[PDB]
């Protein structure tokens, strides 16, 4: 939403003027973060961990 | 309706003459009469009456 504003002075019996809320958006577009790793099965056998 | 009248004096065996009830109207057309006023909410509040 738009910021707060201030009311306007007006004459007695005169028309109240308009200043309503205005709207906008902030967008998101999530980015794929990725990470990978590969191990040979002989390494996977012989490792202590 | 038309006014009362007087009957015709006649000879014996003579034709009776006509003098039947004639009619008319008076029209009306009602005219719109109007009156109006405005008061402000501040005046309506503050007045002693
Ligand atoms: Mg206006
Ligand atoms: Mg404004
Ligand atoms: Mg005749
Ligand atoms: Mg007559
Ligand atoms: Mg007559």
Experimental method: cryo-EM
Q: Which residues of B touch A13 (CB under 8 A)?
A: 40
Q: Is A14 on the interface with B (CB under 8 A)?
A: no
Tell which residue, B32, B35, B2, B34, has the closest CA to residue B19.
Answer: B2
The two tokens of residue A5 are: 């504003």
Q: Is B42 annotated as a binding residue?
A: no
Q: Is B15 on the interface with A (CB under 8 A)?
A: no
Instruction: Name the residue with tokens 């014996």.
Output: B12
Question: Which string of b and e fits A10-49 if b means at least 16 CB within 10 Å?
Answer: eeeeeeeeeeeeeeeeeeeeeeeeeeeeeeeeeeeeeeee
Q: Which residues of A touch B42 (CB under 8 A)?
A: 12
Cβ distance B37 to B43 under 8 Å?
Answer: no
Resolution of the experimental model in angstroms, please?
A: 2.7
Cβ distance B42 to A12 under 8 Å?
Answer: yes
């Amino acid at each position: 939403a738009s910021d707060e504003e201030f009311a306007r002075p007006t004459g007695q019996g005169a028309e109240i003027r308009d200043d309503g809320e205005t709207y906008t958006t902030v967008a998101w577009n999530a980015t794929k973060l990725t990470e990978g790793s590969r191990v040979t099965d002989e390494m996977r056998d012989q490792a202590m961990v």
